[PDB]
UniProtKB/Swiss-Prot annotation, chain A:
GO terms for molecular function: DNA binding. Coiled coil: none annotated. Belongs to the purine/pyrimidine phosphoribosyltransferase family. PurR subfamily. The binding of PurR to DNA, and therefore the repressor activity, is influenced by interaction with the effector molecules 5-phosphoribosyl 1-pyrophosphate (PRPP) and (p)ppGpp. PRPP binds to PurR and reduces affinity of PurR for DNA, which inhibits the repressor activity and induces transcription of the target genes. On the contrary, (p)ppGpp enhances binding of PurR to DNA and repression of the transcription. PRPP and (p)ppGpp compete for PurR binding and allosteric control of transcription. It holds the Pfam family Pribosyltran. DNA-binding transcriptional repressor that controls the expression of a number of genes involved in the synthesis, metabolism and transport of purines. In response to a signal of excess adenine, represses the transcription of the pur operon, which encodes enzymes of the purine biosynthetic pathway. It also represses the expression of the purA and purR genes. In addition, controls the expression of several other genes or operons, which encode enzymes or transporters playing a role in purine nucleotide metabolism. Keywords: DNA-binding, Repressor, Transcription, Transcription regulation. Induction: Autoregulated. This is Purine biosynthesis transcriptional repressor PurR. Guanosine 3',5'-bis(diphosphate) binds at Y102, G173, S174, K202, G204, G205, T206. 5-phospho-alpha-D-ribose 1-diphosphate binds at A138, T139, K140, R160, D198, D199, F200, K202, A203, T206. Residues 74-269 are annotated as: Effector binding domain.
């Protein structure tokens, strides 16, 4: 059933938005709308231009009758900065101060609207990494991992803090003892390029634990993103990582809490 | 300024990313610096397309207090096709688990699958007045978020570990009493809660969750599970929707039975 341009633009927009990071043959669309490849290409130029102008993302086109298009979610620096500032202000509330130097995030992480933004910012920053899968550890980071994975078009793998399983010992920020994390061996292909995502990085042991867990799968760290990094941790982590926010050494007794920008802007050109 | 074409693309993106939200025509008129008449015409193009393509319903509410609202909906034919495909995939003997369980980890890890399940849940409960989605850690978490994002509501996660509320219940794995808790600061009392879970075997977990909401003057708006163990619709007095039915996996024999759940009852049988 043929759609005229207006109907195709609408359906193509929905289809692209719901199939990010997937190379779609022009052929799939020409047959879907029983339209000429040339009309589709024309429609895609309109979408590509609107997507860039509105800060939705990039449409990459591969020419030829055998060509295709790929939608790449991307966030403009201006929106990233504004979103992060707003989010930081929201967290810089003494009522969130938690024992041990932690921050209460449960409410913000319960909101798909916020997670969507966070996920897209991670997806944007790591758009060009060849990611095969997103990994995080139960449980606070799970929703962040799915948000990022949905923009990236890859599966999520959840490491458990408890079949043929692989296990690694690691230490946590509570400046505590040795714990173990595991992941079933049939949960991930060898050589996978992994984006590690977590909500909070205090000491860096949880992430180092996941990075070490990856060596057991002969997998590679494709990138590392965290919502909040405790002040001065660039030290305890060997791999590059991206953070949206920095929690400056909080104090429960003084009931003060400072929150600054993470290092994310370094990732914008 | 936006030419009609660009405006349709942006409007489409805008509606798709703001479901279950009443948006005043004025907002669009201002965004595109255009007459309301032109916006309404675009909305008709989108409504028609969304309807024919099975994306959802664009609801236009007349009046200055009105506006437009995008409601994600899934056609019955697509839901049946999707559930069957999902069922066939789970009926693989390789997913065998002791105790009458099936391996769901790999599918619960795919946003593509989650998106569909979340949409089907959001579609069935589209007209219920839901304020929050609730699930219990940790398997159901991604399904909960998927449903919640289509419904425009926050997610609340019950912990099985300050002013905390608690309930005790018996899982389907162990007969030992368990405790699920939820911070009092995690949910507004009187909320219409859509409960979501991956697998309902005994029914205790969901029952426990139903009791826990009592403690908040909360009202169960609906219950949705991905898989229900054969023989559970006599262990729950509450109405629930399930996508698949898992017939007691063949312990000794390497076979597994999967059939549609009761979801068709929630489509146009209403």
């Amino acid at each position: 059933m043929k759609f005229r341009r207006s109907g195709r633009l609408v359906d193509l927009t929905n289809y692209l938005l719901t199939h990010p990071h997937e190379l779609i043959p022009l052929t799939f669309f020409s047959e879907r709308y029983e339209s000429a490849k040339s009309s589709i290409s024309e429609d895609l130029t309109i979408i590509k231009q609107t997507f860039e102008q509105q800060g939705i993302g990039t449409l990459l086109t591969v020419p030829g009758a055998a060509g295709g298009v790929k939608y790449i979610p991307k966030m403009k620096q201006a929106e990233a900065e504004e979103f992060v500032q707003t989010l930081g202000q929201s967290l810089a509330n003494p009522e969130r101060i938690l024992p041990g130097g932690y921050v209460y995030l449960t409410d913000i992480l319960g909101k798909p609207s916020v997670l969507s933004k966070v996920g897209k910012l991670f997806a944007s920053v790591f758009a060009e990494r060849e990611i095969d899968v997103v990994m995080t550890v139960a449980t606070k980071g799970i929703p962040l991992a799915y948000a990022a994975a949905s923009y990236l078009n890859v599966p999520v793998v959840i490491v458990r803090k408890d079949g043929s399983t692989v296990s690694i010992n690691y230490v946590s920020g509570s400046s505590n003892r040795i714990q173990t994390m595991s992941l079933a061996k049939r949960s991930m292909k060898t050589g996978s390029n992994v984006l590690i995502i977590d909500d909070f990085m205090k000491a860096g042991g949880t992430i180092n634990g996941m990075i070490n867990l990856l060596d057991e799968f002969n997998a590679n760290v494709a990138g590392i993103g965290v919502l909040v990094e405790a002040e001065g941790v660039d030290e305890r982590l060997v791999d590059e990582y991206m953070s949206l926010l920095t929690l400056s050494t909080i104090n429960m007794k003084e009931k003060s809490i400072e929150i600054q920008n993470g290092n994310f802007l370094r990732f914008f050109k």
